[PDB]
Amino acid sequence: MINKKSLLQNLLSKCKTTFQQSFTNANITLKDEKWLKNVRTAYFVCDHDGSVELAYLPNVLPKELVEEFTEKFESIQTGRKKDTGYSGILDNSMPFNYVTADLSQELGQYLSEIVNPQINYYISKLLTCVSSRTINYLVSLNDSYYALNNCLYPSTAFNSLKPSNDGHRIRKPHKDNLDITPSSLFYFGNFQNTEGYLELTDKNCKVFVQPGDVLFFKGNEYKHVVANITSGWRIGLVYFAHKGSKTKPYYEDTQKNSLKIHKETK
DNA sequence: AGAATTCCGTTCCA
DNA sequence: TGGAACGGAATTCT
Ligand SMILES: O=C(O)CCC(=O)C(=O)O
Ligand SMILES: [Mn+2]
């Protein structure tokens, strides 16, 4: 119900001035139409209403930032058993929001205190361009969430993918169904141009992501999976918000403690 | 103690 | 519907 050529011109205009980069060979498709099979460049997916359900902007992060974060991420993850980590709040399995167990650890500290305040700026950049509805929602959240995660997004996921790990949750095709808003994704580490791509299975679209790129898309609606890497290290951050952020209460404590607090108020 | 297993609890889907 | 799934443990075995 709208012109895609003009909408792309609008999005490109905002993104060019905001990120101060020229995005060549940018493309736009409606969600109903046939998506590009291979996206190495700027790409946008919209509905009939005009809202952006996917945005991919190549290399918006300064190389100095990607390299420093990578080195620290790899340093911390070495001393970690699990291949995933989380900062901010999680409502998973509980009818309340709770502080992640990792926030007290080295990973959670580095994300919240150092990484997130810097990344929060590029998130602000991204949202003011592609989605107004998202940032309008994120600023309505409890102040405690913003203070906790030091970011507009109340929750941050840390995905460490080493070569030939098929057991990682991002290696299995899925949807994140708790998400009330499209997530913002940042990538780090080093891996090849032909591997570690995010594939949307139902739309048959392969987005090839490299360190420094940003990806903004709905995780609940579109089933997606991360491809295997034969070399390098694939590290990425997922900034999201669940439904429980608005709906469920907050006791300002970790999971087990909050459960005790939750019951005693009932 | 340091392994394997069960548990609390929400949400979904083949 | 059983059971896996962006958690995070406590029990229960060797
Ligand atoms: O890292 C990616 O490219 C995707 C992450 C993802 O799908 C998830 O965290 O569920
Ligand atoms: Mn996902």
Domains detected in chain A: 1-266 (3.60.130.30)
A198 close to ligand 1 (CB < 6 Angstrom): yes
Please state the φ and ψ torsions of residue A149, each to the nearest 5 degrees: -95, -5
CA-to-CA separations, A142 to A20, A61, A104, A132, A248, in angstroms, rounded:
32, 28, 21, 19, 11
A199 close to ligand 1 (CB < 6 Angstrom): no
A38-64 per-residue burial string, b: 16 or more CB within 10 A, e: under 16: ebbebbbbbeeeebbbbbbbbebbeee
The sign one gets for the Cα dihedral A197, A166, A183, A33 is: positive
Torsional class of A141: left (φ above 0), alpha (ψ -120 to 50), beta (otherwise): beta
Residue A197 CA to ligand 1 centre (angstroms): 10
What gap in Å lies between CA A135 and CA A131, rounded to an integer?
7
What gap in Å lies between CA A61 and CA A211, rounded to an integer?
8
Q: Name beta bridge partners: A187.
A: A236
Question: Hey, how many other C-beta atoms are within 10 angstroms of the C-beta on A135?
Answer: 17
- A34 CB below 7 A from strand C atoms: no
What gap in Å lies between CA A172 and CA A49, rounded to an integer?
31
- Tally of CA atoms within 13 A in the half-sphere of A4 that contains its CB: 14
Give the 3-state secondary structure of residue A127: helix
What gap in Å lies between CA A236 and CA A255, rounded to an integer?
25
Helix, strand counts (H, E) of chain A: 8, 14
Q: Are A134 and A54 in contact (CB under 8 A)?
A: no
Give the 3-state secondary structure of residue A218: coil
Q: Is A187 annotated as a binding residue?
A: yes
Residue A83 CB contacts under 8 Å (≥ 6 apart), including other chains? A159, A160, A161, A162, A165, A168
Dig out the tokens for A247 from the structure.
């709906």
In angstroms, what is the resolution? 2.7
A157 close to ligand 1 (CB < 6 Angstrom): yes
Give strand B nucleotides closer than 7 A to any protein Cβ: 8-13
CA-to-CA separations, A82 to A86, A102, A120, A157, in angstroms, rounded:
11, 11, 25, 13
CA proximity to A141, closest of A81, A97, A191: A97
- Tally of CA atoms within 13 A in the half-sphere of A142 that contains its CB: 19
Please state the φ and ψ torsions of residue A87, each to the nearest 5 degrees: -125, 165
Q: Name beta bridge partners: A238.
A: A157, A185
What gap in Å lies between CA A102 and CA A106, rounded to an integer?
8
CA-to-CA separations, A234 to A46, A50, A60, in angstroms, rounded:
28, 33, 18
Q: Name beta bridge partners: A56.
A: A43, A215
What gap in Å lies between CA A225 and CA A200, rounded to an integer?
7
Q: Are A186 and A237 in contact (CB under 8 A)?
A: yes
Q: How far is the CA of A247 from the C1' of C12 (A)?
A: 37
Q: Is A262 annotated as a binding residue?
A: no
What gap in Å lies between CA A222 and CA A202, rounded to an integer?
7
How do strand A205-207 and strand A38-39 relate by DSSP bridges? Answer: parallel
Ligand 1 atom 7: residue of nearest CA: A170
Ligand 1 atom 10: residue of nearest CA: A170
By what technique were these coordinates determined?
X-ray
Question: Hey, how many other C-beta atoms are within 10 angstroms of the C-beta on A21?
Answer: 14
Please tell me the number of the ligand nearest to residue A159's CA. Answer: 1
Q: Can you give A223-260 as a three-state secondary structure string?
A: CEEECCCCCCEEEEEEEECECHHHHCCEEEEEHHHHHH
Q: Are A163 and A112 in contact (CB under 8 A)?
A: no
Please state the φ and ψ torsions of residue A182, each to the nearest 5 degrees: -60, 130
Q: Is A109 annotated as a binding residue?
A: no
Question: Hey, how many other C-beta atoms are within 10 angstroms of the C-beta on A79?
Answer: 9
Ligand 1 atom 8: residue of nearest CA: A170
CA proximity to A164, closest of A93, A213, A67, A232: A232
What gap in Å lies between CA A24 and CA A92, rounded to an integer?
40
Q: Are A172 and A114 in contact (CB under 8 A)?
A: no
Residue A181 CB contacts under 8 Å (≥ 6 apart), including other chains? A133, A134, A137, A138, A240, A241
Q: Residues of A from 102 to 131 whose C-beta is within 7 A of strand C: which are they? A: 102
A176 close to ligand 1 (CB < 6 Angstrom): yes
Please state the φ and ψ torsions of residue A73, each to the nearest 5 degrees: -60, -45
